Symmetry: C2
Subunit: 253 residues, 2 copies
């Protein structure tokens, strides 16, 4: 179980992936990370919240807003579930539901239902020499050796990956990753292969630092079964940066 | 609405009481403050937890244990409800449900369901010249002018009062009170009247300081429809201080 990588995606799919190949061993399909039933743009990656009066980021996440209600009208909720699955691992997720409400009118101004795996905070452990690159609005993943920039594996999961978990010390430990645009991520994987071919010695790829350095901070807004959502991302040269009108990138709020 | 005092009792009764008389204007009957379905002794006054290996107090309350799960097996939950009632006041309470669980066995080691009104923390506001004395395992209340010790009113509610709320700035503000044993509280109200009679000038009563000073810290353990619970309390001379065997007082853990 210490060789598995857990891939949490937007539609509820948790993937038991080979930290080596990146291939699926077993797929667990549950509740979709977000279910905003427009008002607030959630962040599949941690309940963060945004609003569009341009595009701004509030100061409280979804859980926080919940673990701080009633308030003034705010309705909070927080049921927990544990998942039992023999490879037996006890993985637990939390269903956070929030609710806006105006005493003036008589309707639910806003609503959202953001799930999220209980896991230990991510810490820069030198023992982890891997780095993961993720596409916004797409299941593309570029796992590329942290101690170089040497591409370890490319994968395309059904739905966009929202978070990564490694089962350290019997239980999940969230592994920090990078958000890059499909365009740029493909464009990058492309060159990686070209340089790989002309060279014939390894498929290069930027390092989290070079990447986060040379690209350009953007705030991506995606769509999910009629549920919008922002989420930081990097974009390269020649990518438009501001319903189909709101979707896509925007300049960091 | 600024003249009402809200009396939260163990069986779910919220009382709209005259901050002057102490009499009920309107009664709101909802879910009982505790519903431990023996293991952990809850505290109707804030989810605090205790265990009896004598009688000790853990470091985390019920909400905290919930707003910190899943964990390791701990199951948390936190639905909120708002109550609308025209005197219209919007009072909100939170239903906290917790759950213990051993991966070893296959049964729910423990469980509890503690409700609690959303209200602003209590602060020593010099504008509030009242003091409330409460009996453990009884609906006796001795409201006695803070700026003296002069008895303002005596009341006996159906079920034991767990907390007091004052609707300051449109919304509840929890008012700190004192936990004394029925015995002592009756014994006190008694003398108060005797001295009142021989004197014919006012019914005295200790001040939160004299009381909390001359009495003796005890940890009361009560019972509620087959649900035990600890809860600090003061006791005077000649009161036994250690199921009917556990109920009653004990020396401060």
């Amino acid at each position: 179980p210490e060789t598995l990588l857990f891939v949490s995606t937007l539609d509820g799919s948790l993937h038991a992936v080979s930290k080596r190949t990146g291939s699926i061993k077993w797929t667990l399909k549950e509740d979709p990370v977000l279910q905003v039933p427009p008002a607030f743009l959630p962040d599949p990656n941690d309940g963060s919240l945004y609003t569009l009066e341009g595009l701004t980021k509030l100061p409280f996440t979804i859980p926080e807003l919940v673990q701080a209600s009633p308030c003034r009208l705010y309705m909070g909720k927080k049921q927990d579930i544990w998942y039992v699955i023999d490879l037996l691992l006890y993985l637990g997720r939390t269903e956070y539901t929030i609710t806006m409400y105006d005493t003036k009118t008589r309707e639910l101004r806003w609503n959202a239902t953001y799930f999220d795996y209980a896991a230990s905070l991510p810490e820069d452990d030198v023992d982890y020499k891997m780095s993961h690159f993720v596409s916004n609005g797409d299941g593309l993943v570029v796992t590329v050796d942290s101690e170089s920039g040497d591409v370890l594996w490319i994968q395309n999961y059904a739905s966009p990956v929202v978070a990564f978990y490694v089962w350290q010390r019997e239980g999940l430990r969230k592994v920090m990753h990078i958000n890059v645009a499909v365009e740029t991520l493909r464009y990058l994987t492309f060159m990686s292969g070209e340089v790989g071919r002309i060279t014939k010695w390894k498929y290069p790829f930027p390092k989290e630092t070079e990447a986060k350095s040379k690209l350009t901070p953007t705030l991506y807004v995606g769509k999910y079964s009629t549920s919008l959502y922002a989420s930081p991302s990097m974009v390269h040269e020649g990518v438009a940066v501001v319903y189909w009108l709101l979707i896509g990138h925007h300049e960091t709020p």
